[PDB]
């Protein structure tokens, strides 16, 4: 079956919002990660 | 086996510095049909289109979540 | 109450009047059974 | 211990009992030759 | 109280007794299919002897209950 | 019908009734059955997607349980 | 009325071919992939798809159902064939059966 | 392996054949035999037999009476006194000789005459219910 | 906790269990047609052998009841093999409609033996060559298990899928407590659960003509 | 409660009884799968038995849950 | 009191040991069922030999019973 | 609490009920096996028997396991 | 005392292992049945193995009493 | 913890029950044998149902474990 | 003492497995009457097989008596 | 210690379980007397598979055992 070229726009939409998507993980995990070990703490 | 790559090659790729002009011209048409409300003349078969794959630049965004928190099943912390 | 009596009453009659008559007093004692049984609770 | 042993029978009338059982349940086409075939002659003296 | 609770613990026990006589009609009655599925001629004669059988084998089991009850209400 | 229309006045022009609905879903299901299963030299799919579509609403009403065995906490 | 003589064409027994060409032309063939992966990626990752003992059961099912299938698929449907073919020649059997009678009378 | 010899006084129907299983009523209950099988004798009762060719097909006959013996050597002898195919049979007069063999039955008093009766009647039921 | 799975579902407020409860029949199409596709084809061969292996033993009235019978004998089938699809809820496993499938067949069976035939009825009660010294208990022991075999079928079928499905799901949730920890024994034990699973389906199946096999038998002793 | 305990440790020792009936059920089947594979031509009849002698093993079962229950609600 | 509690358990523990006698009573009237009904000539001498075999069954069954009372009463 | 550990005494005495299906099965498989070996012609039909036996086994085997959950979760 | 309790409650139990003796007999004295019923010529000879069988069922029986008494008095 | 004896304690009697798994393959491998004995031309199939057989023995032993762990650990 | 009393009891339980060894007995000698008296000729062979059924038997149920010393005299 | 009693009683009621594993080999070497008395001719072949009956018979018995010992010793 021949191959579709995606139109631009979704192709430059689909690898941006991948990069927004790292930098939204990558920057919740770290706004997250001193909460967790605190109430982690402060549970016992 | 090696097909995936060969499709990859075509609809799987970092899209390049030269096409991003028509990616704005789209842009500007889909604004210009929310600003004039002409989305009215879209038939719902379409439409239902464009929202699905919307919903599939949205996953685009959810898996780039996923892999930049390094955890696949919720945060870790 | 047409289409309704004619494709579900129609063909039943002969086993809800003769056929399953022991099967309606079996069903009345399951409720009072059924009944009892909620009542004490 | 069958029943017909206990009543004083033996094998062989079991036997003759049965095959005119089947010869008698014979249709009429194979009827007269099967009884031919096992028509007893012999007589006791 | 403690003579109570004793009871019903041992009513339990004695009941779990019972197990004998079911395994006991089970054994009689597929004997009795087996030696009527041999030699049928004698069905009425042995179903005489399963009855016998069970009749003795319930017996035992009656036991049991007897206790229970003889337990349960008369101690 | 849908997939056709753009306009919402054809929401209000369907027959919201009990009548109407019940008609609907016969219509559907008719539909269905037509197209998948009414045919010789048929397949399994007609049926692994129904069983499919089923495992999706059981796990709809018992997501009420299961939400409470979640392994993270965010 | 006679019957269609095909299905629906589904892909693995689950999504209809309709769906994969009416993708088609967006994002070409790949893109119903992307958006399956990325809609069981989200919704085993927001929680909306917890993991649990249901998640082993399932897929021990779906095992055996699978493998039904491509075990004993060709035999039940070349039955369903065969009890098909066998009441339509016993009726042609009757079909021209009578006719060979009167013919006589 | 099995060398099978299915006779009757008049006709040889199988001998020293390779069969595969052969099932006989015996009088002490029907069973099978296939190659290998445990050395024994029995005598019959009347009822069908069914013998297995190693294809696959079997033929279906009926036997009055007589002997079956399977020894060390896998090599079974069976003898019948009266070995019919079923064809040659019909249910009617199967009927109607059980009907008269129960009413000589329940006429008769004399042991030995009444299990002569009762014997008609087992070979004529074994009849009927083989037929069909 | 542990009982997640057998209570009475509800989405959005409504007791969506009515709606599983009535859904099997939805798999079984009929057509007024000569020829027809596969499914209806061997889903009518089906009926056809399930109704010549049970009502082929009773008189000409209790096959009047065969309309009964055989549709009893497809819906719980159904149902239990739908139970089996994950996350399901197996209406069988609640004690309140086997009881409402036991009680009322039962019930109308005995009725129906009591109201004619009283006679024999009341002397099935007694095995036929009793000696005397032992007649009156051999009436109380039958008395008794008559009046509880519907007890016994809608246990037997009840806690039967129960137990199984628990069960799955426990060792579900071994194999669950088994993926962080040595991956040859999660196989076995996902093995294990494979089998099961293949067990489970037979057990449906069984249970299934096991119920309509017990219902059976009673209408053919009180006909 | 010591009676509340009591009361449970005799519902799981009446329990106990029902093994009879189990092996009972058994040898009752494996009988009849015996008889019949050797007087085939009675297998309706033998079936008859087979049920009644399953019908009085699960009798004697049912009386250990009998006492279960009437230990566990009625007392 | 604890002893009387105690005595009232062991006379279940020991009151389940009839089980025993049950399933032997069980497979004896099993046995003489086919003996008899293959030999059936010998029915007689064969009737004997199950009442002697009843007449211990239901021996060991008595011990336990023995001890059942030898523990309910004598102590 | 006592009530909770009559519970587990009491539950662990309902399952050891189970050892009469385990038996059950074993007897109804093993006459299987032998039924077969004598008339293997009727393979299917004795079969389908096996399986109502072993049908009826588990039977009570389950409410064994019943009574045994019935106390553990629902007292 | 807990001592004499514990002594009660052992007693019990080791007196329910007589069930297999009893069981034992049972299948003893059937077999015998079964095995007259086919040779009885040899009847004689076979009452002879019978006992013995009979001489070693018993015997595992007593072991059981034995701990029974050898608690009850000796302990 | 009395908490933790009850897990020992109604460990130890749900492992009680697979006395029946023992006595269940016993009994499938014992007339595996017979009815090899008698038919060897079919080992092969015989096998066959003796594995199933055993299956199914081995099942209901399974769970009495099941609960012996899903007590000793999950409980 | 709490421990001289579990011992006692674990002794009791510990000892019930001879059971095991009774029935064991019981069928080992049933089937070699059976089996003697199908096929006398062999007897002294068959006689043989029976001792070493019996040396295997009579095993186990020494593994059980084995724990009840080795708890009361050894622990 | 009321945790060291209660592994006492526990490892006694986890060794009950052997009483499967004796019947199970009773049962098996009396089906090979007869099987060897019926076809003597396969008497090799039949003692293989009543080795593997066995050799799965103790097995059940073993994992007995292991959980008295895994108690006892590891618990």
Known sequence: ?44 | LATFWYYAKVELVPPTPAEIPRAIQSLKKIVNSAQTGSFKQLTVKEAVLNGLVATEVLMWFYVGEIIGKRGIIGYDV | LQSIIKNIWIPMKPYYTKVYQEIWIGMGLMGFIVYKIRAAD | ?45 | DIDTAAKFIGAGAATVGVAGSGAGIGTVFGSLIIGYARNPSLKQQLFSYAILGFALSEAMGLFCLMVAFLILFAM | ?74 | PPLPEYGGKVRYGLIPEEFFQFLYPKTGVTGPYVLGTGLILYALSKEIYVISAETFTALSVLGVMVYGIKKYGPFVADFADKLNEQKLAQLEEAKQASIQHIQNA | ?132 | ?223
């Open chain 9, 1 to 223: 906790n542990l009982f997640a799975s057998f209570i009475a579902p509800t989405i959005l407020g409504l007791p969506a269990a009515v709606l599983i409860i009535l859904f099997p029949p939805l798999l079984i199409p009929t057509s007024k047609y000569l020829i027809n596709n596969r499914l209806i084809t061997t889903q009518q061969w089906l009926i056809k052998l399930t109704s010549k292996q049970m009502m082929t033993m009773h008189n000409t009235k209790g096959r009047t009841w065969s309309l009964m019978l055989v549709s009893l004998i497809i819906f719980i089938a159904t149902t239990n093999l739908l139970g089996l699809l994950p996350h399901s809820f197996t209406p069988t496993t609640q004690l309140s409609m086997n009881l409402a499938m036991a009680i009322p067949l039962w019930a109308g069976t005995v009725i129906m033996g009591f109201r004619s035939k009283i006679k024999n009825a009341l002397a099935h009660f007694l095995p036929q060559g009793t000696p005397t010294p032992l007649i009156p208990m051999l009436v109380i022991i039958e008395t008794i298990s008559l009046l509880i075999q519907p007890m016994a079928l809608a246990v037997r079928l009840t806690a039967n899928i129960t137990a199984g499905h628990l069960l799955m799901h426990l060792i579900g949730s071994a194999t669950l407590a088994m993926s962080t920890i040595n991956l040859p024994s999660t196989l076995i034990i996902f093995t294990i659960l494979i089998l099961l699973t293949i067990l489970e389906i037979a057990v449906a199946l069984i249970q299934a003509y096991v119920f309509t096999l017990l219902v059976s038998l009673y209408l053919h002793d009180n006909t």
């Open chain 4, 1 to 45: 211990v069958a029943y017909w042993r206990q009543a004083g029978l033996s094998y062989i009338r079991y036997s003759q009992i049965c095959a005119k059982a089947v010869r008698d349940a014979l249709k009429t086409e194979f009827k007269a030759n099967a009884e031919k075939t096992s028509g007893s002659n012999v007589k006791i003296v």
């Open chain 1, 1 to 44: 079956v021949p191959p579709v070229q995606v139109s631009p726009l979704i192709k430059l939409g689909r690898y941006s919002a991948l990069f927004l998507g790292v930098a939204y993980g990558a920057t919740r995990y770290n706004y997250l990660k001193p909460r967790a070990e605190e109430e982690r703490r402060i549970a016992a």
């Open chain 6, 1 to 74: 019908e849908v997939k056709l229309g753009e306009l919402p006045s054809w929401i209000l022009m369907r027959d919201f009734s009990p009548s109407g609905i019940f008609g609907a879903f016969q219509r559907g299901y008719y539909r269905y059955y037509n197209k998948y299963i009414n045919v010789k030299k048929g397949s399994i799919s007609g049926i692994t997607m129904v069983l499919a579509c089923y495992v999706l609403f059981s796990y709809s009403f018992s997501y009420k349980h299961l939400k409470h065995e979640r392994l993270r906490k965010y």
């Open chain 8, 1 to 132: 392996q099995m060398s099978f010899t299915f006779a009757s006084p008049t006709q040889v129907f199988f001998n020293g054949a390779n069969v595969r299983q052969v099932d006989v009523p015996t009088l002490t209950g029907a069973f099978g035999i296939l190659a290998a099988h445990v050395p024994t004798l029995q005598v019959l009762r009347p009822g069908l037999v069914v013998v297995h060719a190693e294809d696959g097909t079997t033929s279906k006959y009926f036997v009055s009476s007589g002997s079956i013996a399977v020894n060390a050597d896998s090599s079974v002898q069976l003898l019948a006194e009266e070995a019919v195919t079923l064809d040659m049979l019909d249910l009617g007069a199967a009927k109607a000789n059980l009907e008269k063999a129960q009413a000589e039955l329940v006429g008769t008093a004399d042991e030995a005459t009444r299990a002569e009766i009762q014997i008609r009647i087992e070979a004529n039921e074994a009849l009927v219910k083989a037929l069909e």
